[PDB]
Design a protein around this ligand. Structure first.
Ligand SMILES: Cc1cc2nc(N)n(CCCCC(=O)O)c2cc1C
Lengths: 216, 226
């Protein structure tokens, strides 16, 4: 049962050199595994990078190189650029079938950028349906680590919110996140103050965006 | 100029079958090996199998060797994948991939990939999305930029596509990945920042589309009236 493994994530700074590895659970990776690499950019855009372990694919900048390091196959990016932010997949050929690794998320360090916070009260139309969705938006920040806490009339909520985060923006290398608090129309009407508290490295003190139900 | 376009995805019933197709162009299809790769939710890529030019050699991933059938029609520059005995585990994005095969140099690379076609193996019914407006919590006087958007909630199965002003507006747009709600329904938001001043003059419309339920909605987001 061959299992190809890769480091889940790595972070490097521009101009730096980084190496992603690919190991086999059945032993050392070898030339006969024909290790190959694929890059996944946002929107399910994949592109072949390396083939035959160390041979670059046409159109691939020379900053990319392949090789065997120890018992693993590796992809080395010299002079990392922000355009290199992506997920790199590795695959090994096991005699009669191809096995992909779990992929490595490569992040490119950039300066701290605090998020712009926005809170969206539920729409009237949505309320008619009996449900109320409160949305909180954290826009273009970095690093990704950000804590968003919901408070309904100073009562810290829990278990009733889901969040989504975008891929590191190719341009500014930032992330954007949204947290959605979902309540029954009933509960929503049982409270007044709805606030979103955001904590992030780029903020000296947590930022709170809020609104009082009914207040326009 | 290589182009790979998949089709055939959609909601299917467990135990059922489904035939996916891929249209190719930009290269001598007849001279290349073709490959199918899929990606299930929260998972990485998984090789399904490949087929050589003359269809005389067809390799499959150990497991699906039987419930999966690959074929091609060089005359029509097409690649097919016949799925069968569909189980929830087969729910994934199916990619059509061209394989540059060089046995002389032992160089094998999956160069060009299509963007895939989504396939959901569920017993649930198809449901359309409700599009709610995320009104600009700002005015013109405030000066600067305001955030607004659309909340596409309670639909099934994936995926939904969202654009603004029929594509005219793309800068500042952030369409988050859909989230699976406890209800088993999907939901997502799409926001975008515009200049406060344009609020009241410029019209902001988000165009939501959900093929599975043949839903098409254009919601106009305006500043909530106070
Ligand atoms: C991505 C990839 C796909 C492949 N499909 C086949 N069928 N082989 C086997 C290659 C031929 C075996 C040989 O002559 O050594 C593959 C190798 C790689 C790296």
């Amino acid at each position: 049962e061959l299992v190809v493994t890769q480091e889940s994530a790595l972070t490097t700074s521009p101009g730096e050199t980084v190496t992603l590895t690919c190991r086999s659970s059945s032993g050392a990776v070898t030339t006969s595994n024909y290790a190959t690499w694929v890059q996944e950019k946002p929107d399910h855009l994949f592109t072949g990078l390396i083939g035959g372990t160390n041979k670059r694919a046409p159109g691939v900048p020379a900053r990319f190189s392949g090789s065997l390091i120890g018992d693993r196959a590796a992809l080395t990016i010299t002079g990392a650029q922000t355009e290199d932010e992506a997920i790199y997949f590795c695959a090994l050929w096991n005699s009669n079938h191809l096995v992909f690794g779990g992929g490595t998320k490569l992040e490119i360090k950039r300066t701290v950028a605090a998020p712009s916070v926005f809170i969206f009260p539920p729409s009237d139309e949505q309320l008619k349906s009996g449900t109320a969705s409160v949305v909180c938006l954290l826009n273009n920040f970095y690093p990704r680590e950000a804590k968003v806490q919901w408070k309904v009339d100073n009562a810290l909520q829990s278990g009733n919110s889901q969040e989504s985060v975008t891929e590191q923006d190719s341009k500014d290398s930032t992330y954007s996140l949204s947290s959605t608090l979902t309540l029954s129309k009933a509960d929503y009407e049982k409270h007044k103050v709805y606030a979103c508290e955001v904590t992030h490295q780029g903020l000296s003190s947590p930022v709170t965006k809020s609104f009082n139900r009914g207040e326009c | 100029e290589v182009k790979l376009l998949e089709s055939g995805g959609g909601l299917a019933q467990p135990g059922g079958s489904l035939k996916l197709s891929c249209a190719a162009s930009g290269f001598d299809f007849r001279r290349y090996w073709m490959t199918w790769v899929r990606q299930a939710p929260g998972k990485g890529l998984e090789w399904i199998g490949d087929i050589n030019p003359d269809s005389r050699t067809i390799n499959y991933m150990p497991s699906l060797k039987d419930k999966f059938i690959i074929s091609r029609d060089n005359a029509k520059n097409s690649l097919y994948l016949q799925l069968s005995r569909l189980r929830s585990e087969d729910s994934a994005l199916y990619y059509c991939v061209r394989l540059d095969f060089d046995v002389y140099n032992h160089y094998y690379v999956l160069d060009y990939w299509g963007q895939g076609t989504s396939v959901t193996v569920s017993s649930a019914s198809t449901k359309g999305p409700s599009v709610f407006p995320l009104a600009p919590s700002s005015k013109s006087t405030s000066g600067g930029t305001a955030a607004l958007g659309c909340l596409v909630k309670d639909y099934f199965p994936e995926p939904v596509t969202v654009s603004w002003n029929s594509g005219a507006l793309t800068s500042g747009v952030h369409t988050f990945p859909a989230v699976l709600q406890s209800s088993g329904l999907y939901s997502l938001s799409s926001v975008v920042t515009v200049p406060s001043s344009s609020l009241g003059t410029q019209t902001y419309i988000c165009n939501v589309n959900h093929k599975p339920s043949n839903t098409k909605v254009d919601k106009k987001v305006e500043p909530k009236s106070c």
